[PDB]
Design a protein around this ligand. Structure first.
Ligand SMILES: COc1ccc(CCN(C)CCC[C@@](C#N)(c2ccc(OC)c(OC)c2)C(C)C)cc1OC
Ligand SMILES: *[C@@H]1O[C@H](CO)[C@@H](O[C@@H]2O[C@H](CO)[C@@H](O)[C@H](O)[C@H]2NC(C)=O)[C@H](O)[C@H]1NC(C)=O
Length: 532
């Protein structure tokens, strides 16, 4: 009367599992807006210093947008690539000075650079018709650093949330966390759009970052626990695919409405619908059974059999763990580093997370010049992930879960290496090589997530995956400074480091035990002898 066999009897993947998976995938997309970052709220368009006198002249004679930028604005390329043109204003009186359209300012100085440069007051004039956060608070020239501060604060919030949000989810249940966390995320999201100043917006976004990953991973571990042992692959890969579909829909809607506040409100409000559909999914049977609440576990098992339509087994009355467990099974950070096998697995997984994040950031940084349309580039980037899900879904149960991950990490490393050594000049080959590298990186990410979830015990699974994921955020935060610093030492130093890191990660992946078709553990002592 173990949880595995009885679950198979009612059905590993039945209508109940299908409905629960669909309801959770509805939640998967809601994490795309929070994780994408500030790419759609903080895009910086072209900008010049507003001038009152230009408005009067704009109507007197025929004008064009390109023409106006040319001989009304200070020229670029002097004392910087575009520092003068971006946020410097000559301040020469353009009003009550009828110098003709042909020679508006040429006559006065007979030279452009030598002209007088005044302050860039009167705010700014931006190109895009829509409004972003940069346009809202004029975070353009003097406060340009504030965007980096916002991004870094959001990232450190992510890191803290990874470190801490796991314990509450693990100790107090997975449904309670998925409810409170998503509720806080929703109530902050709609609140950010009504944020008056720069501080409040940043605070609400920091809170949402603290809570979002906790919500997403609670849902992931809930669905993984619900699905049978054989079908973990399908559920996990489809959850990731649902996240990608949410990302694509985000790109589409972001193109639909540019205004950042309306975007945030439209993205946040639908989360209340999912909060309304919390009624469907009950607590994971495994967590309840481990916590010694067998009555509710059997009550739930009766329901799944009912919804499945297959008669429940008569043996449920004696449902329990394989061996008589202790009264208390509380999760704690202390228990995560006691068993040498568990400690080794945790270290390997943390290093794999860090390597994946660093390699991803390096690959995206070393990409080619950005396209004219940001939205199309983002859509293509999201689309490249679907082939990864197609590939991973067909090989996990036929070749295992260790060799694919090792080969994917090594493939991303070799992609970086070929980018470095072989000619990196603009060619059709380079874009395809970058796409292959991106596919390898996303395969690494998804495989690491799945194996890390499947490796830890049921009563500490969420905490372990959280702690191991925190290193991904740490690497994402730290890598830009590392790449900037190393570039000074030598021209191509960063890519050698990327290649060696990838090779070492691929090598270390081999130590991790295989998990092809093995029931996920429920006791730490059981997880210690998993390999044996
Ligand atoms: C610049 O825009 C982008 C921003 C981010 C990305 C992300 C690339 N990958 C989809 C990352 C996969 C990592 C991800 C998975 N799977 C993940 C899973 C578990 C994690 O730990 C619990 C985790 O850590 C943050 C990330 C998702 C949920 C974010 C692509 C982008 O291109 C579309
Ligand atoms: C950019 O602005 C300069 C203004 O100095 C333009 O140079 C003028 O070009 C016209 C012909 O298009 C000549 O008749 C003028 O004599 C030029 N000015 C001077 C001071 O020699 C230049 O053409 C502009 N370029 C664009 C693409 O708008």
């Amino acid at each position: 009367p173990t949880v595995d066999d009885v679950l198979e009897q009612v059905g590993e993947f039945g209508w109940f599992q299908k409905q629960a998976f669909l309801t959770l995938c509805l939640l998967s997309a809601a994490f795309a807006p929070i994780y994408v970052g500030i790419v759609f709220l903080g895009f910086t368009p072209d900008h010049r210093c507003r001038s009152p006198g230009v408005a009067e002249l704009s109507q007197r004679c025929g004008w064009s947008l390109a023409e106006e930028l040319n001989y009304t604005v200070p020229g670029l390329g002097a004392a910087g690539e575009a520092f003068p043109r971006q946020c410097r204003r000559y301040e020469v009186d353009w009003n009550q000075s009828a110098l003709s359209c042909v020679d508006p300012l040429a006559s006065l100085a007979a030279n452009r650079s030598h002209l007088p440069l005044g302050p860039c007051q009167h705010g700014w004039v931006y190109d895009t018709p829509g409004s972003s956060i940069v346009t809202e608070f004029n975070l353009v020239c003097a406060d340009s650093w504030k965007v980096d501060l916002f991004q870094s604060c959001v990232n450190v919030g992510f890191f803290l949330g990874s470190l801490g949000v796991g314990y509450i989810a693990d100790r107090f249940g997975r449904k309670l966390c998925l409810l409170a966390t998503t509720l806080i995320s929703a109530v902050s999201g709609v609140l950010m759009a009504v944020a008056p100043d720069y501080t409040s917006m940043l605070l609400f976004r920091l809170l949402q970052g603290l809570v979002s990953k906790g919500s997403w991973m609670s849902g992931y571990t809930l669905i993984t626990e619900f699905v049978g042992s054989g079908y973990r692959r399908t559920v996990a890969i489809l959850y990731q695919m649902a996240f990608t579909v949410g990302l694509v829909l985000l790109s589409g809607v972001a193109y639909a409405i540019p205004h950042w506040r309306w975007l945030q409100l439209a993205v946040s409000l639908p989360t209340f619908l999912f909060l309304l559909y919390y009624w469907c999914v009950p607590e994971s049977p495994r967590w309840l059974l481990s916590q010694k609440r067998n009555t509710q576990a059997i009550k739930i098992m009766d329901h799944i059999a009912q919804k499945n339509g297959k008669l429940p087994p008569a043996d449920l009355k004696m449902l329990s763990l394989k061996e008589d467990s202790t009264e208390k099974l509380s999760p704690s950070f202390a228990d995560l580093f006691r068993t040498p096998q568990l400690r080794k697995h945790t270290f390997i997984l943390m290093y794999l997370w860090f390597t994946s994040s660093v390699l991803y950031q390096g690959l995206i940084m070393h990409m080619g010049a950005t396209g004219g349309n940001l939205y199309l580039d983002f859509f293509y980037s999201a689309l490249v992930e679907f082939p990864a899900a197609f590939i991973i879904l067909v090989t996990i149960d036929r070749v295992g879960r260790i060799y694919p991950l090792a080969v994917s990490n090594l493939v991303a490393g070799a992609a970086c290496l070929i980018m470095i050594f072989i000619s990196q000049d603009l060619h059709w080959l380079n874009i395809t090589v970058a796409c292959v590298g991106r596919m390898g990186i996303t395969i690494v990410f998804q495989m690491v997530c799945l194996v890390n979830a499947e490796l830890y015990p049921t009563f500490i699974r969420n905490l372990g995956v959280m702690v191991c994921s925190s290193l991904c955020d740490l690497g994402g935060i730290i890598t830009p400074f590392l790449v900037f610093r190393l570039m000074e030492v030598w021209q191509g130093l960063p890519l050698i480091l990327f290649t060696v890191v990838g090779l070492v990660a691929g090598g270390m992946t081999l130590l991790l035990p295989e998990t092809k078709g093995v029931a996920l553990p429920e006791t730490i002592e059981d997880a210690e002898n998993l390999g044996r």
